[PDB]
Design a protein around this ligand. Sequence first.
Ligand SMILES: Cc1cccc(C)c1NC(=O)Cn1nc(Cc2ccccc2)c2ccccc2c1=O
Ligand SMILES: Cc1cccc(C)c1NC(=O)Cn1nc(Cc2ccccc2)c2ccccc2c1=O
Ligand SMILES: Cc1cccc(C)c1NC(=O)Cn1nc(Cc2ccccc2)c2ccccc2c1=O
Ligand SMILES: Cc1cccc(C)c1NC(=O)Cn1nc(Cc2ccccc2)c2ccccc2c1=O
Ligand SMILES: Cc1cccc(C)c1NC(=O)Cn1nc(Cc2ccccc2)c2ccccc2c1=O
Lengths: 79, 79, 79, 79, 79, 85, 85, 85, 85, 85
Amino acid sequence: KTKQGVAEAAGKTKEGVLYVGSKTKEGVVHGVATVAEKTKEQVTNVGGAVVTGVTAVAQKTVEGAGSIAAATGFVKKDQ
Amino acid sequence: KTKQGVAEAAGKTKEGVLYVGSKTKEGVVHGVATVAEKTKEQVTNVGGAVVTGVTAVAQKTVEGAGSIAAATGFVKKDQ
Amino acid sequence: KTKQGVAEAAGKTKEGVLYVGSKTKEGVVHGVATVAEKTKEQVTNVGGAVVTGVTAVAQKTVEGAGSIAAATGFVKKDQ
Amino acid sequence: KTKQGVAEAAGKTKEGVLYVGSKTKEGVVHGVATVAEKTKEQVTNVGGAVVTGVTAVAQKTVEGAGSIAAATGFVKKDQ
Amino acid sequence: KTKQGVAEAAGKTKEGVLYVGSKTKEGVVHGVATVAEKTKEQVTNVGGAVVTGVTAVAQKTVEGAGSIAAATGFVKKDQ
Amino acid sequence: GVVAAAEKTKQGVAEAAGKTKEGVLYVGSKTKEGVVHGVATVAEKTKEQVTNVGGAVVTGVTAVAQKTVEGAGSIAAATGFVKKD
Amino acid sequence: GVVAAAEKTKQGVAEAAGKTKEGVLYVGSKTKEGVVHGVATVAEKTKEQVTNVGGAVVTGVTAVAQKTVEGAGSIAAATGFVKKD
Amino acid sequence: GVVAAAEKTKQGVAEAAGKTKEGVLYVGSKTKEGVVHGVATVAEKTKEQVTNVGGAVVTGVTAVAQKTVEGAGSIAAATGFVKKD
Amino acid sequence: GVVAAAEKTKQGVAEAAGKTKEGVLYVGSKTKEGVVHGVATVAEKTKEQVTNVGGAVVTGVTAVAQKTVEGAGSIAAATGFVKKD
Amino acid sequence: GVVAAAEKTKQGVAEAAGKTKEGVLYVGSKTKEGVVHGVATVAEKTKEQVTNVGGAVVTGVTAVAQKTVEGAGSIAAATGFVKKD
Ligand SMILES: Cc1cccc(C)c1NC(=O)Cn1nc(Cc2ccccc2)c2ccccc2c1=O
Ligand SMILES: Cc1cccc(C)c1NC(=O)Cn1nc(Cc2ccccc2)c2ccccc2c1=O
Ligand SMILES: Cc1cccc(C)c1NC(=O)Cn1nc(Cc2ccccc2)c2ccccc2c1=O
Ligand SMILES: Cc1cccc(C)c1NC(=O)Cn1nc(Cc2ccccc2)c2ccccc2c1=O
Ligand SMILES: Cc1cccc(C)c1NC(=O)Cn1nc(Cc2ccccc2)c2ccccc2c1=O
């Protein structure tokens, strides 16, 4: 037997009100807020990569080796 | 046996009100907010990549190796 | 036996009100909001890629290796 | 037997109100806020990588070796 | 038997109100706030990497050797 | 006098505003005004006797949520001789 | 007098504003005004006797949440002779 | 007099503002005004007797949350002869 | 007189502001105004007798949270002859 | 007179401000104004007798949290003849 990332809840009663709940979060992006007010941005690009926005990436994988969740704003010239 | 990312809930009663609930979240992007007010953006691009918007990516995979969830704003010139 | 990303809920009673619920979320994008007010955008592009909008991608796959969920705003010139 | 990252809760009563709950968070990005007001940004790029935005990456993997969660703003010229 | 990162809670009563809860956090980034007001940034880049934004990365892995959670703003020219 | 000009350009934007007043805006926000959440009551053997003569009585398990803009919110009001001239 | 100019450019933006007043804005925020959360009561054998004559009485398990803008929020008010001229 | 100019450039921005007044803004924030959270009461054998004549009485398990802007928030008010001229 | 200029550049920004007044802003902050949290009461055998004549009485387990801007917050007020001219 | 200039540059920023007044800002901060936290009371056999005539009485387990801006916060006020001219 093997348990990994398991949320367990048990409750027992005879008379009254009983509440049982279980929650699980794996690879979750929650609550991203961005505000830009009266912002000046001047970009001159020649063959490059420029990133100025908002990026939110959430990845969950099982039995995955070598995976990349995010790769933002890069120049790759492998030979 | 093997349990991975399992949410379990059990409840028992005789008289009254009983509530049982279970929730699971895997690779979930939740709550992304962006505001731009009176923002000036001037972009000149010659053969490059420029990203200024909002990107939200959520990926869930099983038995997947080498997967890329997001690749935003890049220049690739592999030989 | 093998359990992965399983939400389980069980309830038992004799008299009264009983509520049982189970929810599962895998590769889900939820709640993306964007506002642009009085925003000036000037873009000059010559052979490149420019992205300024809103992108929301959700991907769920099983037994998929090398999959890419999102690839936004890139220049590819592989040889 | 083996337990890893397991949240367990148990409750028992006879009469009254009983509440049982369990929560689990693995690889979760929560609560990212950014504000830019009256900000001036001038960028000149020639074959490089410039990143000025907001990046939020959350990755959860099982049996994954060599995985990279985030790789932002880099130049790679491997031979 | 082996327990690692396990949150356990148990409660027992006869009459009254009983509350049982368990929480677990592994590889979680919480509460990142950044404010830039009237900030001037001038960047000239020629073949390099410049990073000025906000980066929040959270990674949780099991049986993963050699994994890199974040690699921001670097130049790699391995031979 | 407010003047905005743009001459001899390739892409030009010229905006002029005399007076401007911004407003209220919500983006991905949650609000709760006058909200009752999660009330649980258990009673086994309760004896209640009420003798009310010309008054307001509130008895039992009561869960009241009120949201008022230009009025009054009351639960029990035993008044008299209310006049507006 | 407010003047903004931009001449002999490739990309030019010229904005002029006389008077500006910003507003209220919420981005990914949560608010709670007058919220009752998580009330649990257990009673076994309670005896209650109420004799009310011309008054306001609040009895029992009471959970009240009120949110008022331009009015008064009251639970029990036994008044008299309320006039507005 | 407020003047902003930009001449002989490739990318040029010129903004001029006479008077500016910023506003209130919330980004990823939580607020709690008048919030009652986590009230638990256990009673076994309680005897209550109330004899009210022309007054306001609050009895029992009471959980009140109030949020008022331009008014008064009261729980028990036994007044009289309220007039506005 | 406020003047801002930028001439003979490749990337140029020129902003001029006469008068500026910043505002209030919250970023990733939490606020608690008038909050009651975590109240637990246990009573076994309590005897209560109340005889109220023309007054305000608050009895029992009471949890009150109030947040007022331009008004008064009271729990028990037994007044009389309230007038505004 | 406030003048800012930038001439013969590659990247140039010129900002001029006559009068500036900063505001209040919170970044990752927590505030608690009028907060009651963690009140536990245990009573076994308590006898209470109250005889109130034209007054304000507060009795029992009381947990009150108040936050007021432009008003008064009172718990028990037995006054009379309140007038404003
Ligand atoms: C709630 C309650 C119960 C029992 C005793 C009382 C005093 C109250 N309070 C109020 O009625 C508050 N009020 N008063 C007035 C003015 C008015 C009232 C009665 C007769 C003539 C004029 C009013 C007018 C227009 C729209 C709303 C309202 C309002 O809401
Ligand atoms: C809540 C309550 C219960 C019992 C006893 C009292 C005194 C109160 N308090 C109030 O009624 C407060 N109030 N007063 C007025 C003015 C007014 C009241 C009555 C008659 C004529 C004029 C009012 C007018 C318009 C909209 C709201 C309101 C308001 O809310
Ligand atoms: C809550 C309560 C219970 C019992 C006894 C009292 C004194 C109070 N307090 C108040 O009514 C406070 N108040 N007063 C006034 C003015 C006014 C009141 C009554 C009659 C005529 C005018 C008012 C007007 C408009 C909107 C709100 C309000 C308000 O809220
Ligand atoms: C809470 C309470 C209970 C019992 C006894 C008292 C004195 C109080 N206190 C107050 O009513 C405070 N107050 N007063 C006034 C002015 C006013 C009051 C009554 C009649 C005519 C005018 C008022 C006007 C407009 C909006 C709010 C308010 C307010 O809040
Ligand atoms: C809380 C309380 C209980 C019982 C006895 C008293 C004296 C108090 N204190 C106050 O009412 C304080 N107060 N006074 C006034 C002025 C005023 C009051 C009554 C009648 C006419 C005018 C007021 C006006 C507008 C908004 C708020 C308020 C306020 O809050």
